[PDB]
């Protein structure tokens, strides 16, 4: 009936975010693309209705009702492009849509300098609890979940200082361990070779 | 334009569930959807006049109402675990487009006791020194955890204004024991500013995490603090040295 890509798609920023959508009736007329950021609800962005392309800013959607497809091409992707992105097509005269199943579009940032490092934090309120924060790496790294029970490592996350035109990934660990340490969480979702490590002060 | 009737509900197994979505917008279809991770968007009910209700994809726990034009009535006669769901409502009409304009959502956990929801401790952690003098920028992290259920919304404020350049929450709050089907979670954020404007002593850095939990119209028999909807925030103030 109607069948999407299935994701998670990561696509590194400045390059093409694309989904697909394949439908079974030859004879269905609307088609319509859906934003979702996490935890939100979905936005029209773009609908289309013959074939060829339809823009709108960066978003081009195209159908092809011959080999009955339809996809979003998202240029020059952002990532602040991540979202869940579905398509949509009717199918009855009263208005009816089936949704595609959605799927995940995650745009990682470019990062031109890494400067990977991982460094400790203390609570304003107690210096007794603490976190760690891995942070400044390139996008091919891979923050690992925790295996540890007691351990906990969140995903990574991307941040952008828009006054500095500088956008930075990061992941947090922490522990109610005595013995814990912060090369005891990132090292095993790994750090690269040049990593600074600064002993904690 | 579309509105429901709760952004976040907390329910025990076997309690009715009413969720209202109405539209003041004339509109002749509404339908309701739920949506969950690896399933997307399913359709449970649809509606194409007041009177009218068809059995969507998946109807099987749910029954619906529309004796209203401009209310799509989504009952749950007996909730189950496995009705923890977004759940989306939507409405359109035969106009120039047919597109379906959704409602903003309504987050429901399911849960088999309430004596597991918990309200979140947060903390807010100053940025490592030796981060300021790599690389001149002052990480802070804002850290909830132990809370019950996943139903936060968290917020940084410089000087009393919301701020958003320079910060990021995890999209998914984690599991403290992932394979617990009624574990609590934690949640982190983080705030970055240039290591000049953390140095400020009279700069204020709050984060306020925003927790829905139980109602005043619902009875608690425990020792501690009954787990209402709340505000709880960490803050830390900027520092010389």
């Known amino acids: 009936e109607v069948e999407q890509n299935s994701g998670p798609l990561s696509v590194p920023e400045g390059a093409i975010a694309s989904l697909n959508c394949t439908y079974s009736?030859?004879?269905?007329?609307?088609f319509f693309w859906y934003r979702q950021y996490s935890g939100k609800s979905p936005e029209l962005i773009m609908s289309?209705?013959?074939?060829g392309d339809k823009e709108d800013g960066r978003f081009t959607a195209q159908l092809n009702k011959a080999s009955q497809y339809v996809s979003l091409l998202i240029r020059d992707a952002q990532p602040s492009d991540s979202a869940t992105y579905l398509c949509?097509?009717?199918?009855?005269?009263?208005?009816?849509?089936?949704f595609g199943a959605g799927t995940q579009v995650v745009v990682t940032p470019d990062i031109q300098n890494p400067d990977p490092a991982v460094y400790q934090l203390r609570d304003s309120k107690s210096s007794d609890k603490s976190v760690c924060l891995f942070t400044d790496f390139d996008s091919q790294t891979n923050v690992s979940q925790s295996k540890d029970s007691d351990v906990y490592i969140t995903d990574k996350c991307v941040l952008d200082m828009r006054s500095m035109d500088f956008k930075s990934n990061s992941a947090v660990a922490w522990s109610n361990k005595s013995d814990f340490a912060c090369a005891n969480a990132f090292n095993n979702s790994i750090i690269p070779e040049d990593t600074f490590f600064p002993s904690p002060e | 334009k579309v509105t429901q009737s709760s952004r976040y509900l907390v329910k025990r197994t076997g309690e009715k569930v009413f969720l209202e979505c109405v539209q003041d917008?004339?509109?002749?279809?509404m339908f309701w959807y739920r949506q969950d991770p690896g399933l997307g968007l399913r359709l449970i009910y649809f509606?194409?006049?007041?009177?009218?209700?068809e059995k969507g994809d998946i109807p099987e726990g749910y029954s619906v109402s529309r004796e209203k034009k401009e209310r799509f009535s989504l009952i749950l006669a007996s909730a189950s675990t496995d009705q923890t769901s977004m759940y989306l409502c939507?409405?359109?009409?035969?106009?120039?487009?047919?597109?379906?304009?959704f409602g903003p959502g309504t987050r429901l956990t399911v849960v088999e006791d309430l004596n597991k929801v918990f309200p979140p401790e947060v903390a807010l952690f100053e940025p490592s020194e030796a981060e300021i003098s790599h690389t001149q920028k002052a990480t802070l992290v804002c850290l909830a955890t132990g809370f019950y259920p996943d139903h936060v919304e968290l917020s940084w404020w410089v000087n009393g204004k919301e701020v958003h350049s320079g910060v990021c929450t995890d999209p998914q709050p984690l599991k403290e024991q992932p394979a617990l089907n009624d574990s609590r979670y934690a949640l982190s954020s983080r705030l970055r500013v240039s290591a000049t404007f953390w140095q400020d002593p009279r700069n204020h850095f709050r984060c306020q995490v925003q927790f829905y939990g139980l109602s005043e119209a619902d009875e608690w028999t425990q020792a501690r603090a009954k787990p209402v909807t709340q505000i709880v925030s960490a803050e830390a103030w900027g520092r010389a040295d």
């Open positions: 939507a409405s359109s009409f035969l106009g120039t487009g047919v597109e379906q304009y």
């Open positions: 009736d030859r004879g269905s007329q609307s």
């Open positions: 289309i209705y013959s074939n």
């Open positions: 949509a097509v009717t199918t009855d005269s009263w208005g009816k849509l089936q």
């Open positions: 917008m004339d509109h002749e279809n």
């Open positions: 509606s194409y006049d007041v009177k009218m209700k």
